[PDB]
Structure to design on (1189 residues):
């Protein structure tokens, strides 16, 4: 009886998951009772695993008993979740047999449970009842002005946004999201503020409201106490913004920081995106990004075309460069790059002159021109001058006899800047120590 | 071993003569040193090259003006060296802490 | 700067130890 | 703790040394000596 | 109204009317049909932005454009190619490409682009090309007669060096108090019971 | 130890595979003679399939008939020992059949046979010898997975206990692996360690072995250690007396006699390309040697004329200019060029500057880790 064996395995997994959910709701209730929110973040920490297992109808199993004191949820949840339980199921699991006091479920608690249901139907692909139910949850959260509810609110906002994105509409999300963001700024929330900022930024980006989003970010202050995930998203967004806006140095540093702060274990899609953007910005600025990324296991498949591109540019042959663009434009646009591809159409010569400068001190203008195939050896003068404008290289030029003098590098150590960097890091370390000694916890 | 012991004498004595003649100098003419030691310019500069490679005297040749810039090699900052080693060591330590935390969390 | 690194790392170690010990203790009182 | 669902998807370390050049030396030294 | 602003050379009217033009074109894409006289004016705005040197907003509106229209159209294409030339630095080619104007509407914005080019080369020669003489300056900076460049000496005239070299690219104090503050702060942080 | 297999067979195979060497009639003759004599039935079949050789029919038929007769008698002897003899000799019988599977070229069959023999066996020496056979096959067929796992098993056995003879044999195996995988540092270390007690003669001729030791050492040794080990190496000089070329290479480098160093490097490059083991490293090695030559030349100068570079290396000027520019771009040199006035300057950073740079980098990395962990925990 393969069907019976599968049913038994599924049922035991269902019992385990129900116990886990009971533990999580215990975390929530004890958090609110003890006045500490972070336990909510803990309980949410393993949400991805709960979603993965997806508790297909263990949702129904749990809710049927969970939702009695506030059964007003039943009218909604039960019809949407059907009643597929096998007629024989001798568990009747529910908190204190559901109710020893029949008190209402705590806002955080039922919000989280309804959110789990939202996730279930999310992966179930039914985004009409799902979007309506998400909107209902949004009404709940908007009504419920409880601090600890902040984190659950942020997650609810994330997931509503995701479903509306799949519906490919947004817009109403833009407006409502914006209202919520202003609300969560008026009330000094940090994680929600950052999360909502990220969502709204991505919404602008999808429709390509780049310049408006630029004003938004510039005029909005990101929170420091935001989760690695949120910082990674926000940094990626700001990086794409500035890269399109022709601030390549900021693009590089910001996206590199984003990749550093991103988790290494997973999020391969995010890693691929960040790597693509960093690759392109660095290539524009001249630096040929290391081969470590290309040889990374979870990236080479996603980056063949970028490797072909870097090969073409390093060769400095527009023939293979442009034919590579021909072959792989579709994915290039799919990510959104052609603007940056033309920026490269430009910066090929910039990188050539950059390396030329790096490998000379007093080379002749005509020599560099013929080295770069740049006919009419005055176009070369203009090009190097523009390079100086940009700051890609540091070298004066003397047209009197036509030669570029590379600036004599100075002993930076014989300055104050090492002191400045070390002061910054000293403050960094002292702050880390102080916050840790704050984070000390002591039992009574 | 006059076949080659004479050669080792030649080499070590030439080294001694060069170190002696150059100690009382700073950046100085290679040709002038060659006249001082009465030996071919190419050979003297070459021997100086090997001496420098082996870190015998803190000096650097220059085939431009054709001179030899001597200097005083300052002590390497063992403070920085120990700092670098300690940084690697705490890399290991914090890695251990990280693994422990993930195991217990 | 290096000495500050020393201080920070040791403090962080202390935090990890205290956190895990307290979690295990509260788990015990749970059971 | 998070996955960013929004974003979907020779054993050694070498640089761009590939550089599609011919024999590193044989041809180079042969031609150089011929000229020289 | 936009073409009227162009005819009157009234940049404020031009920009405002083209702002409404964007708000109309890019807002209600499906509810509206293609505006036959839209890409021409939008490429003319490309030229406008390039001439004002507002490159950031220029690229923003580029990306907001549909991808294929970047290349398929001539009105859109021509400003883009000119911009690529300017970014590269082939200002000689830029000047040579004056004639290739898809629409006569691209008029006087070319001239704003020209004097913007002049200002760009001015900054170029300022912070680089040390001590350039008058003749080289005139031949490179495609100004008018040497009298007109003597007038252009209105543009701060550098100093003209000894021989009209236009000068050049113009080019301690222990921060004791501030460093003392920093170290005092280090000690403070090390010292509090916290 | 026995040629199970004879890796010169793989060398000949790679040679034949090489484009201009596909027409190596003499190598063809040697390889097919060896195939016939050692009964390389499956190995020859794979060989002719890979290189499109006309599949031998009649000679191969008699060859496979002999192979089948041998297999039948071997398996029958195995059965006899199993039914009547004890474990001690049954193990020898299965080991012998696995060895014959090697002597034919039954790769997976030999793998399984040696696996079972090791599983049953109890002698540590026998276990290590079987692992040696496995490793030899694995190197013969570049199955790096196989080599690494067999090395793992061999080491584990050794920490359990071992004899220095097989320690040396394992070190030689590991050095050959490091060479195959471009790990010249550990390769040279192990090669110079084992030169004292080279014993795995089966792997390769001693002369070629010391040739490889010299190459890897030059690559991965600083000038001092090179002095005390290769130039002053007792046998690393006695055998060099016999060697008429690598001697010149090494010394040309050491006493810095140049353009003879480059002629030697070009020669050894051709031979390195011909060799099967080093073939997927000859480009990289040649580049590295050229870089080392340039670095040694420059280390004793501050501003040295490009022209004099040209004469000293016995080459042109434009060629040297191109190479210097390329490697400068690579950033492996602390040197900058002047072309208007042909000269090269050395921008060697202060010890203080360089160490401060390293401190900045390492501090950034470790602080990143620290904030990461502090964050993961405090939240």
């Amino acid at each position: 009886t393969a069907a019976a064996a599968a049913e038994h395995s599924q049922r035991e997994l269902d019992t385990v998951t129900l116990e886990d959910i009971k533990e999580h709701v215990k975390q929530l209730e004890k958090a609110v009772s003890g006045k500490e929110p972070r336990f909510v973040l803990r309980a949410l920490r393993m949400l991805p695993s709960t979603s993965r297992r997806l508790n297909h109808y263990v949702l129904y199993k749990a809710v049927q008993g969970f939702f009695t004191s506030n059964n007003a949820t039943r009218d909604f949840l039960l019809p949407f979740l059907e009643e597929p339980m096998d007629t024989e199921a001798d568990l009747q699991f529910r908190p204190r047999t559901g109710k020893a006091a029949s008190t209402p479920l705590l806002p955080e608690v039922e919000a989280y449970l309804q959110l789990l249901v939202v996730i279930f139907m999310m992966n179930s692909k039914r985004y009409k009842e799902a979007q309506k139910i998400s909107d209902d949850l949004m009404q709940k959260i908007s009504t419920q002005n409880r601090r600890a509810l902040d984190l659950v609110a942020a997650k609810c906002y994330y997931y509503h946004a995701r479903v509306y994105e799949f519906l490919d509409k947004l817009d109403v999300v833009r407006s409502f999201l914006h209202a919520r963001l202003r609300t969560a700024t008026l009330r000094h929330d940090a994680d929600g503020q950052a999360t909502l900022l990220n969502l709204l930024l991505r919404n602008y980006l999808h429709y390509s409201l780049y310049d408006q989003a630029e004003k938004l970010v510039s005029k909005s202050v990101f929170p420091e106490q935001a989760n690695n995930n949120e910082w990674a998203r926000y940094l990626y967004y700001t990086g794409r913004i500035k890269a399109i806006q022709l601030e390549y140095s900021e693009a590089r540093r910001t996206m590199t920081n984003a990749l550093r702060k991103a988790p290494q274990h997973t999020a391969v899609g995010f890693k691929q995106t960040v790597h693509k953007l960093l690759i392109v910005v660095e290539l524009l600025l001249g630096e040929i990004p290391d081969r470590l990324q290309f040889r990374q296991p979870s990236l080479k498949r996603s980056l063949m075309p970028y490797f072909l591109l870097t090969q073409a540019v390093r060769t400095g042959n527009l023939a293979k460069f442009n034919q590579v663009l021909d072959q792989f434009g579709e994915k290039f646009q799919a990510d959104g790059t052609y603007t940056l591809i033309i920026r490269l159409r430009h910066n090929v010569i910039k990188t050539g002159v950059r390396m030329i400068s790096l490998s000379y001190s007093r080379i002749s203008l005509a020599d560099i021109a013929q080295k770069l195939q740049l006919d009419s050896p005055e176009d070369a003068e203009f090009i190097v001058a523009k390079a100086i404008r940009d700051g890609v290289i540091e070298a004066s030029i003397n047209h009197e006899k036509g030669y570029v003098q590379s600036k004599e590098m100075i002993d930076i150590y014989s300055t104050r800047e090492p002191q400045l960097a070390f002061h910054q890091r000293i403050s960094f370390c002292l702050d880390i120590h102080n916050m840790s000694v704050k984070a000390m916890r002591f039992p009574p | 071993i006059i076949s080659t012991h004479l050669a080792k004498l030649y080499d070590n004595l030439l080294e001694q003569n060069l170190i002696r003649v150059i100690e009382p100098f700073s950046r100085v003419q290679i040709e002038h040193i060659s006249s001082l030691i009465k030996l071919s310019k190419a050979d003297v500069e070459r021997k100086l090259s090997q001496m420098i490679l082996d870190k015998k005297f803190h000096g650097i040749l220059d085939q431009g003006e054709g001179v030899l810039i001597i200097f005083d090699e300052p002590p390497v900052d063992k403070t920085y060296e120990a700092a670098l080693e300690t940084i690697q060591n705490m890399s290991k330590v914090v890695d251990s802490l990280y693994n422990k935390a993930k195991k217990l969390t | 700067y290096l000495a500050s690194l020393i201080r920070s790392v040791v403090a962080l170690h202390n935090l990890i130890n205290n956190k895990i010990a307290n979690r295990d203790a509260e788990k015990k009182e749970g059971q | 703790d998070d996955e960013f669902e929004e974003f979907p998807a020779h054993v050694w370390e070498d640089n761009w040394d590939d550089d599609n050049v011919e024999d590193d030396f044989s041809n180079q030294l042969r031609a150089e000596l011929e000229k020289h | 109204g936009a073409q009227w602003s162009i005819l009157r050379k009234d940049i404020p009217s031009f920009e405002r009317y083209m702002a409404q033009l964007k708000c109309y074109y890019f807002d209600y894409k499906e509810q509206l049909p293609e505006s036959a006289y839209m890409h021409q004016l939008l490429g003319l705005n490309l030229l406008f932005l390039l001439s004002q040197n507002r490159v950031a907003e220029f690229h923003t509106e580029l990306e907001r454009l549909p991808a294929k229209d970047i290349q398929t159209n001539v009105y859109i294409k021509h400003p883009v190619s000119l911009e690529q030339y300017l970014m590269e630095g082939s200002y000689n080619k830029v000047f040579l490409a004056k004639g290739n104007i898809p629409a006569e509407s691209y008029t006087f914005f070319i001239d704003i682009l020209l004097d913007t080019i002049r200002d760009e080369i001015a900054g170029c020669i300022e912070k680089a090309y040390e001590k350039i003489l008058f003749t080289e300056a005139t031949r490179i900076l495609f100004f008018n007669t040497p009298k007109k460049m003597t007038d252009y000496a209105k543009k701060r005239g550098w100093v003209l060096g000894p021989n009209n070299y236009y000068s050049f690219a113009s080019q301690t104090t222990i921060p004791s108090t501030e460093l003392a503050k920093q170290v005092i702060e280090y000690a403070r942080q090390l010292e509090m019971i916290v | 130890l026995p040629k199970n297999p004879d890796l010169r067979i793989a060398q000949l195979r790679f040679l034949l595979s090489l484009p201009e060497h596909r027409g190596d009639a003499a190598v063809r003759d040697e390889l097919m003679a060896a195939v016939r004599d050692n009964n390389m039935a499956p190995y020859y079949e794979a060989l002719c399939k890979s290189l499109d050789w006309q599949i031998d029919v009649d000679l191969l038929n008699k060859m496979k008939k002999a192979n089948e007769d041998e297999l039948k008698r071997l398996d029958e002897e195995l059965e006899d020992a199993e039914k009547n003899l004890g474990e001690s000799e049954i193990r020898d019988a299965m080991m012998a059949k696995a060895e014959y599977l090697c002597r034919i070229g039954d790769k997976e069959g030999a793998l399984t046979a040696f696996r079972k023999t090791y599983d049953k066996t109890v002698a540590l020496g026998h276990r290590l010898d079987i692992v040696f056979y496995l490793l030899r096959i694995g190197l013969f067929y570049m199955d790096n997975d196989l080599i690494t796992r067999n090395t793992e098993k061999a080491k584990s056995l050794i920490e359990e206990g071992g004899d220095w003879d097989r320690r040396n044999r394992l070190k030689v195996y590991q050095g050959l692996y490091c060479v195959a995988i471009r790990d010249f540092k550990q390769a040279a270390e192990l090669f110079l360690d084992t030169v004292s007690t080279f014993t795995s003669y089966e792997l390769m001729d001693y002369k070629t072995f010391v040739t490889y030791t010299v190459y890897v050492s030059m690559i991965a040794l600083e000038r001092p250690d090179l002095r005390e080990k290769v130039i002053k190496g007792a046998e690393i000089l006695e055998v060099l007396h016999s060697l008429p070329a690598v001697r010149q290479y090494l010394f040309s480098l050491y006493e810095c006699r140049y353009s003879v160093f480059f002629q030697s490097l070009a020669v050894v490059e051709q031979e390195m390309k011909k060799d099967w083991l080093f073939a997927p490293h000859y480009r990289y090695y040649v580049r590295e040697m050229r870089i080392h030559a340039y670095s040694q030349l420059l280390e004793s100068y501050r501003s040295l004329t490009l022209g004099y570079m040209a004469e000293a290396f016995g080459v042109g000027v434009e060629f040297i200019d191109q190479e210097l520019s390329r490697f400068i771009a690579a950033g492996r040199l602390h040197c900058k060029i002047d072309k208007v006035n042909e000269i090269v300057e050395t921008n060697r950073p202060d010890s203080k500057n360089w160490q401060y740079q390293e401190t900045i980098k390492k501090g950034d990395l470790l602080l990143n880790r620290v904030q990461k962990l502090s964050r993961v925990i405090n939240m």
Observations:
- Chain B touches chain F at residues 46, 48-50, 52-54, 60-64, 69, 76-77, 80-81, 83-84, 87-88, 90-91, 94-95, 97-98, 101, 105 (CB under 8 Å).
